Each structure stands twice: as structure tokens, then as C-alpha cells.
């Protein structure tokens, strides 16, 4: 990474990043199967199995309540409205039955929906299996204080996924803000990334940054159908990788004239990538996220701009107020300190206390020169790479 300090504008350009552009959304539908708990009943009073059974039963009822309320009258409102649309499609009667039948023979299928879209469809059957073959028989005619403790404790550990799913959806009106491991385990995430409609290289990159894949998605409850729970998970599709990107950070550049401040400030800070078609600008910090040397940007947040990176002759984006703003702006490889208007600005080390006081007027600190820069008892920790 090459960070260059442009002193005329109080700015940094940090160069040589590599892009990962979200270009679409993959949809994975889940059927978590609880199995027939309706006819299982305990009549021998307090019991670990009775409580975990009652807990399952009441989770089913809670989810039925949550789905009832869900009535048409790190996720963009854009991303979520997209997902709600997909979910309306899947919540039809026909479509649910289609998916249930697609998963009769196998554990995992590519179901097509009535509009044409293809969705992955997983069956999570561990609880129904445990309930149908292990628990129903160990409950001998309504008696749950079974002497087999290993069985009891297994029930307790087998419905953990279901109840956690029911908690996450019920606590968010059926739209979780991100993707817990109860919604989609890491196995299932990797399996679903590998089936995405893109080429093997983007799939490779995604599988190397699974956690970043998961950060950008979310879940929507579909409904409760019998003793099964249908929900969906939207994974991001990084359909385009490895175009070059740079970040521009800046602060105010004022000259002082005995009372009067003659200021300058760039208004083009953010992330840029020269990918194919245009040069693209991502203006908000939430928009692009770095891991190591790759920068992951939501293409929905992109503005197209022209060729640039001069000083300013061309018409660069900059300000000309008479008003100062003292502040710190942390670049990938350091800091830009903008000191004005009666305030005390300094460098700091985590070993040696106060390394070098700073002078009024925008200084630039490489991160190998400090661990800290403060402006009047507000302390900024520099980024270390």
C-alpha cells in the first residue's frame, strides 16, 4: 500500500487496494423441521425433558404469533426491501409446497420460483430426526423422568438451534439485522457460496472471506407450516473482483493572516475504483470495508465520476470558506492533524508518554511515528499496518 501526503490540500491518497464489488443477492431458503411434538406429553411432573419439550412447544406458538403480526398493510433499506419482495414470492401456498417437495428426497436442492428466480433450499432435519426416532420411543407412555440422562441432555442440546432461531426472529419482527450461526451454520454458508452464479475466482475470494460475506447479509422469517419453520437468508454476491481502488482522506488547509483564516477543504473524500465502464466513487464510510488489501464495496452506493487525481488547470472539488475546522482524519497509514483557533494538539506514544507537541496548521503523522494524536484531551489512536 502506497500512502502519499498531498500537502497543498491537507490530504492523503492511499493506493493499491483491490476491489470486491457486491453485484447481487443469493437467496437460501431453510426448512427447520421440529417433527411431531404435538402428540408428545409428560404426565410425571417436573423433568428436564418436560421443560425442554414445553419450551419447544411454546417456541412454535411464539413463531406462529410473530408470523401472524407480520401482515402486509448493516442492511440498506434497499437490500431489505429487495428481500421482502423475494419473501412475498416464497410465502405463497404453491411456492412453499414446491420447496417442501423439492426437499423430499435430498437435503439440499435448487428450487425455482414461479417468477423464474433460482433459490437454494436446505432442509435442517436434526431435531425432527431426534424427536421422531430417539425421543418418542424413550418417552414410554407419557413418562419423562427417564433414568437415561444422556437422552435428556441430548434433547436439551438438539433443540438449541430451533429455539435460538425463534428467539432471533421473534425479537426482530421476523427480520434479523444479520445472519447468526443459528440461521446459517458455517458449513451451510460455504456450501451456498460455492453454488452461486459466478466464476470460480470470485467464489474462491468469497470462501476466503466468509465472515465478510455473512456481515453483509440478513434473514427474513417466512412462516410456520406444521411443525416446520421456513425462513430465508440473503447472502451477498461478489460477482466482480480485482479492480484497483484508492482512498482519499482530508482536512482543512487554512493560512492565517492575523485574525483572519483563509481556508481550503477537499469535498471528494472516500473510496474510488477504476473498474470497467467508469470510475466509481463510494462516498460514505459504511459503504466500503477493507480486509487486508481488498476493499469490499456495495455497488448500489456507487456514483460514476470522471478521471481525476491532480492538484488544483482542471476544476477539482474543494472549498474556500473563511471558517476553520480543527480535527483529525485517520488515513490507512497514518493521520492528518488540523490544528487552529486556540487549541492544543500533540503526538503520543504508548511506551514513551508525550512525543512532540504539534504546531497550528495541518500536520501529517505516519503511523510509524506515533500511536496517538490528541487535540485538547480527545485522543485518536492511529491505525497500525
Amino acid at each position: 500500500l502506497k500512502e502519499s501526503y498531498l500537502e497543498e490540500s491537507c490530504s492523503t491518497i492511499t493506493e493499491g487496494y483491490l476491489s470486491v464489488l457486491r453485484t447481487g443477492w443469493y437467496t437460501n431458503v431453510f426448512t427447520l423441521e421440529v417433527g411431531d411434538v404435538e402428540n408428545l406429553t409428560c404426565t410425571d411432573g417436573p423433568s428436564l425433558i418436560k421443560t425442554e419439550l414445553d419450551l419447544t412447544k411454546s417456541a412454535l406458538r411464539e413463531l406462529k404469533t410473530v408470523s401472524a403480526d407480520q401482515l402486509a398493510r448493516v442492511a440498506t433499506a434497499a437490500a431489505v426491501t429487495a428481500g421482502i419482495a423475494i419473501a412475498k414470492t416464497i410465502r405463497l401456498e404453491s411456492e412453499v409446497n414446491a420447496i417442501k417437495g423439492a426437499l423430499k428426497t435430498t437435503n439440499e436442492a435448487v428450487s425455482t420460483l414461479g417468477n423464474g428466480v433460482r433459490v437454494l433450499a436446505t432442509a435442517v432435519r436434526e431435531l425432527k430426526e431426534f424427536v421422531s426416532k430417539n425421543l418418542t420411543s424413550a418417552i414410554n407412555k407419557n413418562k419423562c423422568d427417564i433414568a437415561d440422562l444422556k437422552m435428556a441432555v441430548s434433547f436439551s442440546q438438539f433443540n438449541r438451534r430451533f429455539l435460538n432461531v425463534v428467539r432471533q426472529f421473534s425479537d426482530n419482527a421476523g427480520i434479523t439485522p444479520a445472519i447468526s450461526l443459528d440461521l446459517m451454520t458455517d458449513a451451510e454458508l460455504a456450501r451456498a457460496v460455492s453454488y452461486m452464479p459466478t466464476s470460480a475466482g470470485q467464489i474462491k475470494l468469497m470462501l476466503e472471506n466468509r465472515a465478510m460475506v455473512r456481515r453483509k447479509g440478513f434473514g427474513i422469517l417466512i412462516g410456520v407450516y406444521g411443525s416446520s419453520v421456513i425462513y430465508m437468508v440473503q447472502l451477498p454476491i461478489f460477482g466482480v473482483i480485482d479492480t484497483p481502488c484508492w482512498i482519499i482522506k482530508a482536512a482543512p488547509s487554512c493560512s492565517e493572516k492575523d485574525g483572519n483564516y483563509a481556508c481550503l477543504l477537499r469535498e471528494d473524500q472516500g473510496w474510488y475504483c477504476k473498474n470497467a465502464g467508469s470510475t466509481v466513487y463510494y462516498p460514505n464510510e459504511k459503504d466500503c470495508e477493507t480486509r487486508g488489501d481488498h476493499v469490499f464495496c456495495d455497488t448500489a452506493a456507487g456514483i460514476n465520476v470522471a478521471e481525476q487525481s491532480r492538484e488544483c488547470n482542471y476544476p477539482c472539488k474543494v472549498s474556500t470558506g473563511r471558517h476553520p475546522i480543527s480535527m483529525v482524519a485517520l488515513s490507512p497509514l497514518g493521520a492528518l492533524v488540523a490544528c487552529y483557533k486556540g487549541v492544543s494538539c500533540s503526538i503520543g506514544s504508548n511506551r514513551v508518554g508525550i512525543i512532540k507537541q504539534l504546531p497550528k496548521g495541518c500536520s501529517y503523522i505516519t503511523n510509524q511515528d506515533a500511536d496517538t494524536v490528541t487535540i485538547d484531551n480527545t485522543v485518536y489512536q492511529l491505525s497500525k499496518v
Epitope: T41, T51, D54, L55, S58, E62, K64, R167, S170, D171
Partner: antibody
Framework: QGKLVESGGGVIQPGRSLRLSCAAS????????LHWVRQAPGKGLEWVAV????????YYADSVKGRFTISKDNSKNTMHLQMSDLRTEDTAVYYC????????WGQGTMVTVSS | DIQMTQSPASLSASVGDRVTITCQAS??????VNWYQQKPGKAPKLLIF???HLERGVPSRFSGSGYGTDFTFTISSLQPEDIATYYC?????????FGQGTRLEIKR
Amino acid sequence: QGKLVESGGGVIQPGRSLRLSCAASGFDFSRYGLHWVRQAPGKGLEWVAVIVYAGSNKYYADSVKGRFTISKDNSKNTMHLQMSDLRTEDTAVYYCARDQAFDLWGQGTMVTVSS
Amino acid sequence: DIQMTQSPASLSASVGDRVTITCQASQGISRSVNWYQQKPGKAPKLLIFDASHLERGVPSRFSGSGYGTDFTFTISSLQPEDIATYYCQQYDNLRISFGQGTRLEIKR
């Protein structure tokens, strides 16, 4: 089994607030939700509100939607109903019931809404 | 929401006879119906859960039938201490709801 004990019913003026309480012993209060249901002298049983075992989800009968609030404290094993803006219709015996294992009710307290 | 509607309004019958209360659910709640007995100035007592299961120590006489929307509580031979009011309750989901109740009276 264990039991449910309600407390804090009494007389209260029409438009003030009152906080009812329910004390759990003898069962795994942390893994059961509970209900409040009331019956006005004479009349039948009417469901009032429910809270889930986690304490983080609540639902109300429309009678008392917007005035009553239900809460659950697993630390002290106890559930509460905070009634506000009481009307004369609220006069009733207030009952604590365990959800999903419905055999266990409290004995009641009388909330008498009179000036 | 979900409406239980309980019949008859009230019931009078001589000690020994056959009592039959019926509850009808506004929608199909499948077997999620309890039957409660309550004697005046006392907390209700659960007799039948899951529309047909007798609670423990409840006598041979009591029985529940139903699946779907139409349920039936039944006593075979009424006895003195069976005089009370009976309520059905549904628990299809978290929003439970009760029937209007039915009042039993020894006939004379």
C-alpha cells in the same frame, strides 16, 4: 410443583396507576413465559397479557393495549403488571398463569377501581 | 384474533346425568384446547389439556373430544361437587383466549 403468588391489588382511583406482582417458586421460572388474565366480579375469564420466557417479547389484549405493561425479572423470579390510566372496567380479580403448562395459576388479587 | 364460542349459555341437570359442553373455534386450532373448572371465589382448575388429556388425579368421569374447530367437554354422571362453571381456552399461539363459560346447577 411450585406456585404463583400475586400481590398489590387494592383500591385505586380512576386514572391513576397500580403495579401488580407475581412471585414464582418451585419450578423453572426462567424457561416458562406467563400470562395475566382477569375476571370482573360476576363476568367470565378475559385474557390480559403474555410475556415469553426470555422477557423480551410481550403481547396484550386490546382491552389494555397502550395502558398495561408486562415485565419479567428472572433474577428475583417474579413477573409484574404495570397498569396505568385505570378505568372502572379494570375492576376485577387479577390472575397469574403459567403459559404452555397451564395447570399452575395463582389465587388472585382484587383491583377495585373506585373514587 | 381467535374466538372461542362456548355453548350452552347455562345448564341445569340432576345429579347422575350426562353433561355436554361444546366450544367452537373461529379458526382451526387443531388440538390446542384446555377445559377449566372453577368453583365460586376460587382459582380455575385445569381438567383437560390438548383437547382430550385428563390431568392427573382428575376422575374417570371427565372427557374431552375434538380436533380442528369443534370441541366437546363431557361429564358422564354428574356428582354434587362437580357443580361449578366451566371454561374452554385456546392456545393456538401466544395470544390465548377463553370461552364465555357455562354455569352448572343441580336440578330440583
